[PDB]
């Protein structure tokens, strides 16, 4: 798979299909969806690491919406980015 080829776990196919349905441009460079999926997975991994940090702040190994919100609170820049 393309995600496997780039080492990504998130599906480049979903990102490419979202771009297509959005029709953000008359053509999309093949590297563009890979780059976008990589960025999205980077932000997801950041949020998940902070969620693990929050669950540990909660003395638990299971992430829940409370832990996710606390994780967003923990990181100021991501706090402003996500809001």
């Amino acid at each position: 798979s393309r995600s496997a080829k780039a080492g990504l776990t998130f599906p480049v196919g979903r990102v490419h299909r979202l771009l297509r349905r959005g029709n953000y441009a008359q053509r999309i460079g093949s590297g563009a969806p890979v780059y976008l999926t990589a960025v999205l997975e980077y932000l997801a991994a950041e949020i998940l690491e902070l969620a693990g940090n929050a669950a540990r702040d909660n003395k638990k190994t299971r992430i829940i919406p409370r832990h996710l919100q606390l994780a967003i609170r923990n990181d100021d820049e991501l706090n402003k980015l996500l809001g």
């Binding site: 798979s1 196919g13 490419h16 299909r17 297509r20 999309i28």
Partner: protein
Amino acid sequence: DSGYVGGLPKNVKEKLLSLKTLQSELFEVEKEFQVEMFELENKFLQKYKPIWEQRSRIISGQEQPKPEQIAKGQEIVESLNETELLVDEEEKAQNDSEEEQVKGIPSFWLTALENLPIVCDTITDRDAEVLEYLQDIGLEYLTDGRPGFKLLFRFDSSANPFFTNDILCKTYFYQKELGYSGDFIYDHAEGCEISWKDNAHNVTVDLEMRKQRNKTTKQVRTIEKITPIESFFNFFDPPKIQNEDQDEELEEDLEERLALDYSIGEQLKDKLIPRAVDWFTGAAL
């Protein structure tokens, strides 16, 4: 246990041979069972054809829902959870002239296919461009000739700019004998030659052009190149075998491509079309 097998008395070995003969008889009975199932399944495909055609007309906009079917759909919606279909006041204010500007369900079959787990992975955007013109997906059982089932894909020549074929169909074939488990086993598949309007619109190949005053041959020559590429439309023109190359190269070809091709065909035939509406809306997941 080979030692135990040797330990069996000659009489018990004869009994085991008779039991194996009984198993073979059961195999022939299973063959007749499968024949009867195929015949009655064909009958029920005939029975399904009217409803499938009617929903296809609804999808394409050729037909408009009647108030009775509308009420039946509403009461079905009240069952389970489909309140998405409950028409609100804002929509009733609309007029058919404004609504009918878009006729049919846009990208109904494209969405239905892309919602299907195994098959959607093969559909590239270039393939999806043709799928926009897909308005029908039909089933046909090869009662005549070699056993198998044929998938039908329909398009409009006057609309699509890719090929002049109104219908593209894929074929699957089974062996003359049943499988060990009693289910059908597969034979080499075949696909149609897509009548591309031009090679540029062709989606299964990538082309290059160059023109050189090649001094190596004293030729002012123009050259063209064609390279097959991965695409869902490679689902057609399935692999075929040449003995000498079959033994070395196409052994892995049959190991890999045939498995995926058969899995995709079975998934389509079983999951998709019987639940085309649910698959389009995703409820069939």
